[PDB]
Amino acid sequence: ELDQLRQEAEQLKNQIRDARKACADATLSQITNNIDPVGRIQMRTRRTLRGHLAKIYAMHWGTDSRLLVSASQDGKLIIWDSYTTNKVHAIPLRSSWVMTCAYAPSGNYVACGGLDNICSIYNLKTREGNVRVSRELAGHTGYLSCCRFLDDNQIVTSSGDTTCALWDIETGQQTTTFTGHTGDVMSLSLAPDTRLFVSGACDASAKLWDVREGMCRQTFTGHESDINAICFFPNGNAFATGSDDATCRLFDLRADQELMTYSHDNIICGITSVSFSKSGRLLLAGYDDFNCNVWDALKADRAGVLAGHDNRVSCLGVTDDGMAVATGSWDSFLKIWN
Amino acid sequence: SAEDKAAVERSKMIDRNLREDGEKAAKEVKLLLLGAGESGKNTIVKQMKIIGIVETHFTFKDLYFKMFDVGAQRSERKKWIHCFEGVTAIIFCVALSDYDLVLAEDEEMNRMHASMKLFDSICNNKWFTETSIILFLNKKDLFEEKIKRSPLTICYPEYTGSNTYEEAAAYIQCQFEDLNRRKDTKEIYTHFTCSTDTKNVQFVFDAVTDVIIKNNLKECGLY
Amino acid sequence: ASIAQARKLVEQLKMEANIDRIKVSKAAADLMAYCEAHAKEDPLLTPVPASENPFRE
Amino acid sequence: RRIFLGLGMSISYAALLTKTNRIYRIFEQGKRSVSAPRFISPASQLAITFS
């Protein structure tokens, strides 16, 4: 009986593969061959932030494109004024072990996901000037790999436990749970419309979930190893995904297939963070090669190299207006490029 | 920029607090704690405390210790253990009584070999090269009570000793320390403990002190 | 069992793959159109002088 | 005649003292904190000898 269900299941995955094959008239390269090259990019460092002592692990840009939140392996969350390199706030984190941080779209709140399985929300605009701890979100039975603000009242959190969650902040209840994944959800990204999001797990499969019902609208495969970073394309019809096989892939949502592959023989180590630039033409991927790479989003060709850190790049973030890209690395410095 | 001078003042005060707290934390020693389920880590952690991630704080003649209990995480260890790279001690707790036990919900994989496999995965992981492992062969008494009848050959078929306690526990220590391949750089501080007031806190203090001094003598190239 | 859930999902996913069975050429055209149309507001693609970039000013 | 003796009879003991201070500081902080005591690096420590 179980083998019978296994035969139906893979009877339909076969049909799904056939459907994905029916759409593939030509790859992206065959149509984008006529596009003019972007040109060699000489992006240089403009700011270096001498902040945390030990290790930077996550970094997120505020919607103002000026305030910038950074998180450390042990210690505090530092909120920078990126224009003048000031330290607007220092948050004395309860749990030292951090894996993700998020800045609210309104700017009133921040969140440190933490590796202690407890998402900690911090209210910034407090009467007594000190950053207070608002209702902590507990009950995810796994380390919070990534957390993202839907809005001031709704957050989406990815856990080492395969279940992604959506929390209502006033009451702290896990108001929605997405369980379609089989592996540990390493990365998560929210579409610009915020109507739905995507997440990638260790099973080399990305899944596109919607926040209102929770049903898994689509699943994408193709990667040979764990998916560690996903970034939505700015328009929202596509999303790029990095993996330990050192290959960025640009999946499409209204389509359902690979559609692109970003790999070169010179780079072996796996990707760690992806962030489409504004207008989507450039994809910036950090590597364990002690380095960062600027890929053409339309041509499978390297546009430039940053190469300005002494330790592994923790994360990348492009401002909402695209003015500059902050690269936070395992070396304690966070460097802003443009 | 008449008001931004106050912003720079806030930045300098925050930087000062950052540096003081950072030096205070870099003053302290960070010790990992890991092992198989029911390895007896509870008794060990209770002894040092008497003197998600569970952080336990204890002091033994200054040199304030922060201990991190990790067993609580049933998840992918490969993407999690890339943290804890700055720990100056990795307390590995394994119970010698595991040699006799066939299963841990794991297809009749002997708990001892499951522990050795985890030790192999964690000791030789390329994140940890300078971090030293402190090996607690826990429940020495229950092992001494079991070995008197049930031969270690049920766990280690190549063992040919007389099943006497010393010749058995010395074999387990020898095997665990030979399981460490990169012995040129790493050190294994094997110790035998049980549910009594041992020197296990004193032994952790001594091993941590020695590893600290070894690290500092590497910093200046004296060693 | 859980497998009945997995299949109940995968069949639905097939139905979405049939509605989303738009040709890859259309997706390529849409991606190219966005990249071309929203160009010139890419500070990373085309650098801007010191008069407007906030990180030199 | 003055400079040769004044350097030879003093840089020896400055090097001795600096070496012993290195060993002593490293060991007598090791029992107290993990941080490496400042001014022990093999290169910059020579400056203590020149001072």
Question: Considering only alpha carbons, which residue of chain C is nearest residue A323?
Answer: C43
Q: How far apart are the first and last CA of chain D?
A: 22
What is the rounded CA–CA span in Å between residue A279 and residue A321? 10
Enumerate the residues of chain B whose CB falls inside 8 A of the CB of residue A76: 18, 21
> Domain total for chain A?
1
Identify how many contiguous H helices and E strands chain D contains and give both numbers: 2, 0
- C-alpha pair distances (Å), B106 with each of B37, B76, B103: 12, 17, 6
Tell which residue, A260, A265, A263, has the closest CA to residue A250: A260
Judged by DSSP in three states, B147 sits in: helix
Tell which residue, B77, C12, D31, has the closest CA to residue A13: C12
Structure determination technique employed: cryo-EM
Query: In the structure, do chain A and chain C come into contact, i.e. share 3 or more CB pairs under 8 Å?
Result: yes
Token code pair at residue B16: 């000062």
Contacts 24+ apart (CB under 8 A), D18-25: D18/D45, D18/D48, D18/D49, D21/D48, D22/B220, D22/B222, D23/B222
Bridge partners of residue A271, in order along the sequence: A287
CB contact under 8 Å between A97 and B80, yes or no, is no
Query: In the structure, do chain A and chain D come into contact, i.e. share 3 or more CB pairs under 8 Å?
Result: no
**Beta pairing, strands B29-35 & B89-95:** parallel
Enumerate the residues of chain A whose CB falls inside 8 A of the CB of residue C29: 31
DSSP assignment of A30-80 equals HHHTTSPP-------EEEEE---SS-EEEEEE-TTSSEEEEEESSS-EEEE
Residue with tokens 């033409």: A281
CB atoms within 10 A of CB B145: 12
Tell which residue, A66, A73, A70, has the closest CA to residue A50: A70
What is the rounded CA–CA span in Å between residue A190 and residue A232? 7
The single-letter DSSP state of residue B196 is S
Which top CATH class is C3-55?
A: few secondary structures
Per-position b or e across B167-184, b if 16+ CB within 10 A of its CB:
ebbebbbeebeeebeeee
Helices (H), chain A: 2-23, 28-32
DSSP assignment of A114-126 equals -SSSEEEEEE-S-
Tell which residue, A219, A257, A235, has the closest CA to residue A26: A257
Q: Where are the domains of chain C?
A: 3-55
CB atoms within 10 A of CB B43: 18
Token code pair at residue C48: 């801007």
- How big is chain D by its Cα radius of gyration, in Å? 14
**Which residues in chain B precede a discontinuity of more than 2.5 Å between C and N?**
51
CB atoms within 10 A of CB D20: 10
Tell which residue, B97, B134, C34, has the closest CA to residue A250: C34
Alpha carbon A294 to its chain centroid, in Å, reads 16
Mutation pick from C11, C35, C51 vs chain A, by most beta carbons of A within 10 Å, is: C35
Residue B24: its H or E element: helix B4-27
Mutation pick from A256, A298, A299, A318 vs chain C, by most beta carbons of C within 10 Å, is: A256
What is the rounded CA–CA span in Å between residue B45 and residue B33? 9
What is the rounded CA–CA span in Å between residue A185 and residue A114? 14
What is the rounded CA–CA span in Å between residue B215 and residue B130? 8
What is the rounded CA–CA span in Å between residue A66 and residue B11? 16
Neighbours of chain B (3+ CB pairs under 8 A): A, D
CB contact under 8 Å between B75 and A161, yes or no, is yes
D43 and chain B: CB distance < 8 Å anywhere? Answer: no
Category of B101 on φ-ψ map: left (φ > 0), alpha (ψ -120 to 50) or beta: beta
CB pairs under 8 A between B and D: 47
Domain containing A231 — which CATH number?
A: 2.130.10.10
**Beta pairing, strands B29-35 & A325-329:** unpaired
Q: Are A322 and A332 in contact (CB under 8 A)?
A: no
Q: How far apart are the first and last CA of chain C?
A: 63
Rounded to 5 degrees, what are φ and ψ at C7? Answer: -60, -40
Query: In the structure, do chain C and chain D come into contact, i.e. share 3 or more CB pairs under 8 Å?
Result: no
Bridge partners of residue A218, in order along the sequence: A208
Judged by DSSP in three states, B48 sits in: helix
B23 and chain D: CB distance < 8 Å anywhere? Answer: yes
The parent domain of residue A76 ranges over 1-338
**Beta pairing, strands B29-35 & B65-69:** parallel
- Side-chain-side CA neighbours of residue A156 (13 Å): 23
Enumerate the residues of chain A whose CB falls inside 8 A of the CB of residue B21: 75-76, 92
Mutation pick from B14, B57, B74, B78 vs chain A, by most beta carbons of A within 10 Å, is: B14
Q: Report the greatest alpha carbon distance in chain A.
A: 66
